[PDB]
């Protein structure tokens, strides 16, 4: 059955889970760099210890992500009324599938990327039709989606087009946004602008 969350509860929980995840994701990147460095450089026991560690960390990540997605699909996005919340939960679905794809293998990688792209596209359709271009949930969607493109889908072309579009729609609407509303969004815009100038 269903569950609805106030914006502030949503943010609390989302932050908490992202804390956990990001710890585990960065650890995974580091273990892999050590793994590749040793794997190129020989070594018996040490490579075994490192591979076993990387495996254990992948296990934890997949377990957490899969649980997150099962509550999203089972309880949250069915219950979503507002358009901001629909976009929110569909973007979360994209995020956790993308983190699945970040380390996933072969067909598991392929399934994860497909599910992520479905979810981001769903978020996008709602964000277009219900959320201002300066809305932070929309700017976050744009940023994470373009990153999805560039890193996972490896379409720099499409990532950059998405990022520029979102940036400029915002910049356009900006002269017409309040004070307490605009300081709530500058930082996502600058992140999209930074990613973009990076990608050239």
């Amino acid at each position: 059955m269903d569950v609805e969350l106030t914006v502030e509860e949503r943010n609390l929980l989302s932050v908490a889970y992202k804390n956990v995840i990001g710890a585990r994701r960065a650890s995974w990147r580091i273990i892999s760099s050590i793994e590749q460095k040793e794997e190129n450089k020989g070594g018996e026991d040490k490579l075994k210890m490192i591979r076993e560690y990387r495996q254990m960390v992948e296990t934890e990540l997949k377990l957490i992500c899969c649980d997150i997605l099962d509550v999203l699909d089972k309880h949250l996005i069915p219950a979503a009324n507002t358009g901001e919340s629909k976009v929110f939960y569909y973007k979360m679905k994209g995020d956790y599938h993308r983190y699945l794809a970040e380390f996933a293998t072969g067909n598991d990688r392929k399934e994860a990327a497909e599910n992520s792209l479905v979810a981001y596209k769903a978020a996008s359709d709602i964000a277009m039709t219900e959320l201002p271009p300066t809305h932070p949930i929309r700017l976050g969607l744009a940023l994470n989606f373009s990153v999805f493109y560039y890193e996972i889908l490896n379409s720099p072309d499409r990532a950059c087009r998405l990022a520029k579009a979102a940036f400029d729609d915002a910049i356009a609407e900006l002269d017409t946004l309040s004070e307490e509303s605009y300081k709530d969004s500058t930082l996502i815009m600058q992140l999209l602008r930074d990613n973009l100038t990076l990608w050239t």
């Binding site: 932050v15 992202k18 804390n19 990001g22 995020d95 976050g140 940023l143 994470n144 990153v147 560039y150 890193e151 930082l187 996502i188 992140l191 930074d194 990613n195 990076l198």
Partner: peptide
């Protein structure tokens, strides 16, 4: 590649 901040 910098995704949305916590």
């Amino acid at each position: 590649a910098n995704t949305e901040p916590i």
